[PDB]
Amino acid sequence: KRESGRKVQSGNINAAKTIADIIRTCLGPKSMMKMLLDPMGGIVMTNDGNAILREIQVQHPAAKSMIEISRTQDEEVGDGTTSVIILAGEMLSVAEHFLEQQMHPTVVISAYRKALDDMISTLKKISIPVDISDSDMMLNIINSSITTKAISRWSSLACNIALDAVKMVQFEENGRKEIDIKKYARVEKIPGGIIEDSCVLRGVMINKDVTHPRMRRYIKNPRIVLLDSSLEYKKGESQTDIEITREEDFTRILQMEEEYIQQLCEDIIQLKPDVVITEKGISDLAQHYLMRANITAIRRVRKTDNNRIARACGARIVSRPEELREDDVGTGAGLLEIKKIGDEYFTFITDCKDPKACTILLRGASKEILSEVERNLQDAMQVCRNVLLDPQLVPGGGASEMAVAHALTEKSKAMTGVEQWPYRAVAQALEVIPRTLIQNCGASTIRLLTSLRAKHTQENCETWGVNGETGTLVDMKELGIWEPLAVKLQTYKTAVETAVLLLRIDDIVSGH
Amino acid sequence: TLNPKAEVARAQAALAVNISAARGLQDVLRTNLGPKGTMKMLVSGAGDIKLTKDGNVLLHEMQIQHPTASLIAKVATAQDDITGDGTTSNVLIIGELLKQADLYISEGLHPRIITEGFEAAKEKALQFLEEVKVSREMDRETLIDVARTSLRTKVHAELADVLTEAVVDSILAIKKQDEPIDLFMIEIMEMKHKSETDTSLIRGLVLDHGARHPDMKKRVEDAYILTCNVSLEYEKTEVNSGFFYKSAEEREKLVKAERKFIEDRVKKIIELKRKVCGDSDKGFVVINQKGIDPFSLDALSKEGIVALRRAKRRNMERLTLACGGVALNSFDDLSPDCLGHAGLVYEYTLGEEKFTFIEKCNNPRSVTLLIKGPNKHTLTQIKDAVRDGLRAVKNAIDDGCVVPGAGAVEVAMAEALIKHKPSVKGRAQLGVQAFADALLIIPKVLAQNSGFDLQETLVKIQAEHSESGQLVGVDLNTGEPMVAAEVGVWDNYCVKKQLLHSCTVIATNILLVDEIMRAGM
Amino acid sequence: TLNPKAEVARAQAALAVNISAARGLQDVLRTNLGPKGTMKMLVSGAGDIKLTKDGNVLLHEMQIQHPTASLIAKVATAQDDITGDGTTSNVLIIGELLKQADLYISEGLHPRIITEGFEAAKEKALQFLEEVKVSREMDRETLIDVARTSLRTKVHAELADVLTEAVVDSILAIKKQDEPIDLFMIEIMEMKHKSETDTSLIRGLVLDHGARHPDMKKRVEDAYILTCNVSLEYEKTEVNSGFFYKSAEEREKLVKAERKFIEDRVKKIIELKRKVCGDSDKGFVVINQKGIDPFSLDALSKEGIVALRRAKRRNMERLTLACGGVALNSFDDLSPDCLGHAGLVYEYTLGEEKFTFIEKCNNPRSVTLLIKGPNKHTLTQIKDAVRDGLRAVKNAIDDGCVVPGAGAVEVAMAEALIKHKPSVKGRAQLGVQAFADALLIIPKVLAQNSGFDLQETLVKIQAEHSESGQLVGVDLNTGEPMVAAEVGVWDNYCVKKQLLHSCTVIATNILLVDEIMRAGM
Ligand SMILES: Nc1ncnc2c1ncn2[C@@H]1O[C@H](COP(=O)(O)OP(=O)(O)O)[C@@H](O)[C@H]1O
């Protein structure tokens, strides 16, 4: 029914801790697999933290919050999501100070929020900039995802695709340097070819099919037209259908259907275009004028998809076709091609311009290999987004965790009060990240984690992390495990903000 | 630590659940390894019985109760799709790999350390396979040893010489000048009313539907093959008309006019028959897929034509590439350029049905292997053995290298791994030792099924050492060592190659399983 | 097929029961192997507590539920009486031998074949000791490492350096003239009212009861010790008479008359005192075992004579050898022949009690090891350690050859047995492999108790090889390899020799058990 008292906070901890214990071993390159018993007796042997929790049923609402916060991470950053839940579960797993010591959550939350400002400052100290102009460094950075994948045979290809693609979308002139991979980097697959044939189209590719053969097959100077209205007979304000029974009234309603569709098409062809792109559908009578005009018929193109076209070829959006002025012409466009590349038509309006958007062409030998190349390239685009938004990397392999933990432990010495105890407990929670990397490799956890903390005390904290493959210690200057800063800061805030959230819950109430 | 309506195995006992399933599946399939191995029955529940030793059939068609064991069954499907052999030996090595790993995992060893040893033992075992393979030329004497080695594992040691010569000759007819090979060129037919040993080859092709008229020729020693797809039965009016009648007889009178479009096209058939060698000591055959009217059949039958009707898409496909007759979709464009040619064309009468045979062709690029048996399941068992025998001869021809059998490669690779110090990690050799002992399960099981001691057989073949290339195997009749290359036992290079790639990947992934969770089960 | 009140396991389950018992007993004693190993408690039920790592005490004094495990407990009683060490490691090898045998017995191997492999490996294992045994001459530094190696496994690493020099010098005090060392020459005495680290050696004997009178000399630098066994207290009439009294006063007259039997003899002690060097700068001591009246203690104390009473028979025999005076069974025949000679004879004062010490003897051929501790159980703990440390130095001197420790012999013999093929049959190769992997339990367990990974430690010491005779063992503090000779870690030759002969005999006999029948249980 409901929960109240200390049972709530201790219950939310066991729920969040239980969800993290599932994916404790799903961290690093030597991640362990998980067996998911389907209801029909089947098994899925995935090792992805997002896919595991997505398929698991959870009864506690605290678990739904942990999972729903992880999904929000995937939309922004396709990496480090597993670290959020583990840290959020370890930060909450310290229930000694929470209940056994009878401290109020406001005392704990004030310490967790104080450490978060210190964890953020320490990560910027151990950071390091990157020369984004040199693509060789970004290759080593993007290899964190290409490693242990089938696309390693064309690893450099994936970097040049993702690197150059995000640079086109990056509109730095607006100050904030916003990037939109979902809209301005729309990806579409093309059957045929191989992995090497994968490239980036410098334009906008529409997957519209060819309905008739009377369409422009190859053009050197396209002329694209844009409009939102539909090419059909003007209906009434309501959706009332036209019901007719008298034959004499048919020719009247038919003539009204033909003339208005006729006059609207006559104005579209006055500019001598090569393709009519409309947002809404195009009826059969309207297509009879497009095939007669020897121009391509295109429809069902969204607003943002049309906005990129006007920036590419120089077209102009109009409400209706009747108001089409001479400005709506795609002069300077590269070419218009509706070739059937791999048993599927593809509209290419590429040009020699970068209209703050592009389209990625995924060539491949089969749908299985195409999907493998697809999901592997999206993460590379996001790593390029995170580095280009904030070109600062921090040492990975558990080094940034141990480096930050030493700063809090040394800073807690001057922390007079009861908040020093949970403030230090957050530092010991960061050690769980190398604790799992060492557990997966099989090396002794206590022996290496003890020596690992000693290296950060004496030697510089910017290096001396952990090697997940070998298990021994290694400097991140010698091993390119450097991860972005924006991923770690958002990973650290989301873990503390999530733990602060569940700690603020004291009564699970039902009602609507 | 779990939500309601679910379950979770947190500790390492989840791994023991997967090890127990593989150990159980090992003990099931080990009794059907090799020729002397037993057979397993597949009761479909409806009442159909089926006996077979093919591990792919005992895992794909047989549904497995345990959830974990069904995963390994899907791999046997994947193993059969690449090489078509080794599915049984794949499961036995997986069962022993996980068995040997549990001995060290119980001592506190992590699974990830053992899997890194398998990756090292695989590369060493893969390099040693390159040295043992024999790249000799493939001759009829060699492929017979391959076909016998592949067919004796699926039959009662009586259909060996029967299906061996058929399986070998079927392949040699479809490869010359280093051309790429395709097993789809060989058709597999099944017929009853004869003993199991009545299997033989068919150089031509078998057709289902035969001629239907008393005046037909039972055999045509020569004829031009005319491919067609036009319905010579009663069809609708082909012109813009309808049914303008006043009674039933007037409706029937218009059907005569509707038959004018078909009846005249029958004369066009008779015309080209009389034109293209319609003289004495000659014949003509029509293979029209669609139906033919009884009255129209009377016209062609009296002219000495052996007509056929209501054929399948597969028959017309092979009939075209074999005979060369191009399909005419309308008799208006009838011409002699679309005509083929063939030798003997006859219909062998069985006790119940009949089938048309088009044997004695020059180079049809397609043949047929006619299987004969008394029962239904026996024909299916022989169909599987031929497909496994053809794919075995295919691999030996495509991949010109072959390797010895009878566990001689497994015994040699195991000795090489033991004679291999660590190179990736100190503790990795524990997995290399487990990989070595896992390979020895193959000669161990061959000694069990043959009825000999498991330990005496393996120790004798291991003691064979000399200052020269020496590869001994398990003699199923004697039990003593036996040079598999001398007696004529040869396995493919892709079979042993894919075993190491398939065994290591699955034995690795099953070891990396830390927890077993219910996804709403 | 069975009779009432009878049960028998005809199948191989009798081995699975006996093998399971050894594995259980293995897991119990493996935690107390070495100095880093944990201790076991021995609750007698009445409330007494006793802590000890000595496997013989954990098998002789403790009670075991399993009947099969009680057989192995009796073996430790035999192993202790012959060598004095190796009872714990004897049980580990039996469990690991039976563990490896069960792995092969499940594969259909007969038990008798495995026992033949042990007999072949055992004979080869014994020869390896003769090659690696170091016949170093017995000196102080060598025995310190041996006694340290034994005493550290029974104490908290604090009494080791204290007890080491004492146990070494105790044997050297009695070791001379190439005589066989007798442990009866060293008596072990305990004392409360002091801490544990106050243990030290006493050159002479120590007695419980001492002089109790104010007029006694606190220390006697020299004296003619008189050995006697005559009671100087109220005794019965020794002449042809008896006791007849009429009242309490007439009874008191019989005491005065009966006391004259002693009063004439108490002055006899004063006579021989004045007789044999009664001048100045001399002394006299009486060690009469029987009771002495306070009158005689009061009389002789005025003459300056230390008289003792209520001693043991064994102490009187040791006292005669220390002094030289033969025991006089009757004071009437007193003479100087019954006298001896000794040096400083003082009295050690504790908080409550006081003890007699006869240090500075001439030729006792015997010493005493004075143990001191605060608790009762701590005295029994240290006593069991010194008895084990004494036998360790005894075996090192009785058998001048020693061998390394830290499992260095087991790691070496394991590699030696692997490089050795049979000579009776091939299947004995499996038993030799089980013997090889069984000896490695000792270096495996030492890594567990020290808190290090079982596999990393063994692989390092086993991988360490060179082009020369090189030893290698487990470093309990660091976990890295360690040459035992370069650090002072040595075992005995008879211990390792009896270990191989003991484990092979019992692991053999346990494997030959085909059935377990209840004799009316
Ligand atoms: N090659 C490597 N060596 C050492 N540590 C690595 C390596 N690759 C990734 N890691 C570590 O593993 C952690 C998880 O990485 P990743 O799998 O990319 O994210 P997630 O586990 O959230 O999916 C990171 O914090 C990183 O420090």
Ligand SMILES: Nc1ncnc2c1ncn2[C@@H]1O[C@H](COP(=O)(O)OP(=O)(O)O)[C@@H](O)[C@H]1O
């Ligand atoms: N004369 C023959 N002698 C010894 N072993 C044989 C012989 N023929 C086949 N074998 C063994 O039988 C095993 C199984 O063969 P096969 O049935 O083709 O594969 P699978 O059992 O995996 O389907 C092979 O590993 C091979 O070594």
Ligand SMILES: Nc1ncnc2c1ncn2[C@@H]1O[C@H](COP(=O)(O)OP(=O)(O)O)[C@@H](O)[C@H]1O
């Ligand atoms: N510091 C040490 N380093 C290496 N090995 C040791 C050390 N101390 C003891 N050992 C080993 O522990 C073993 C057991 O010693 P001990 O307790 O005397 O016999 P048991 O365990 O059979 O009663 C010996 O074989 C010895 O080699």
